[PDB]
Amino acid sequence: NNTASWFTALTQHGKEDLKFPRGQGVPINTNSSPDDQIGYYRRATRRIRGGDGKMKDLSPRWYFYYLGTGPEAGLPYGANKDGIIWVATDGALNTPKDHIGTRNPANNAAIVLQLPQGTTLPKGFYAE
């Protein structure tokens, strides 16, 4: 368990935690099928030495992982845990996606996180 998300991160520049309305939020991946469109975003916080010499938090990043993969590969869909939010497209199956898995940066670039037309990013969220 030393995983890389298949996608680039969503950066939280605002004060609200990430959330999506039911049916929205699964990044587009042409190498996946309708049954696979389900997973979670996990908040990844980073700290840095600021200009004044004090440690400070950077804007949190949220990375998507297919259900049954990634840092919370053992969590069932819908499990309540701080820093974890769930997303699923209509018709997705609630089964682990080991056949998609996570990405190896040695042989695959991250896929730029894109969401379909009818879905906008929540307040304070940016796909950098």
Residue numbers in the entry: 47 to 174
Question: What do the authors say?
Answer:
The N-NTD possesses a peculiar, hand-like three-dimensional fold, with a β-sheet palm and several flexible loops, arranged as fingers around the central β-sheet.
All crystal structures of nat_mutants with WT-like RNA-binding (nat_mutants P67S, A119S, E136D and P151S) superimpose well with the NTD WT with RMSD values between 0.592 and 1.776 Å. Mutated residues in the above-named nat_mutants lie peripheral to the structural core, which further supports both the converging structures and the unaltered apparent RNA-binding affinities.
